[PDB]
Design a protein around this ligand. Sequence first.
Ligand SMILES: [Zn+2]
Ligand SMILES: [Zn+2]
Ligand SMILES: [Zn+2]
Ligand SMILES: [Zn+2]
Lengths: 43, 43
Amino acid sequence: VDHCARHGEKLLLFCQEDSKVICWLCERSQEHRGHHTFLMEEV
Amino acid sequence: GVDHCARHGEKLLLFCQEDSKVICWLCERSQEHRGHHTFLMEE
Ligand SMILES: [Zn+2]
Ligand SMILES: [Zn+2]
Ligand SMILES: [Zn+2]
Ligand SMILES: [Zn+2]
């Protein structure tokens, strides 16, 4: 799996709103406040 | 450094107050803590 440029954490959450993969710290950040995310099983 | 989660291998960077224990972000996503107050720690 790729890691986040902002936070260095695993890119395993798909943000439906932004049509992109984000990390758990992205999900906590103001930038994805209230955004629906889907956990990806690491392949 | 913080310990790593036995179940997921991710850093134990969240404290769950209701469960009185440190968890990782993958633990937090489980329905186990679905509605719990978690605190983010740094290191
Ligand atoms: Zn991120
Ligand atoms: Zn988003
Ligand atoms: Zn965990
Ligand atoms: Zn909990």
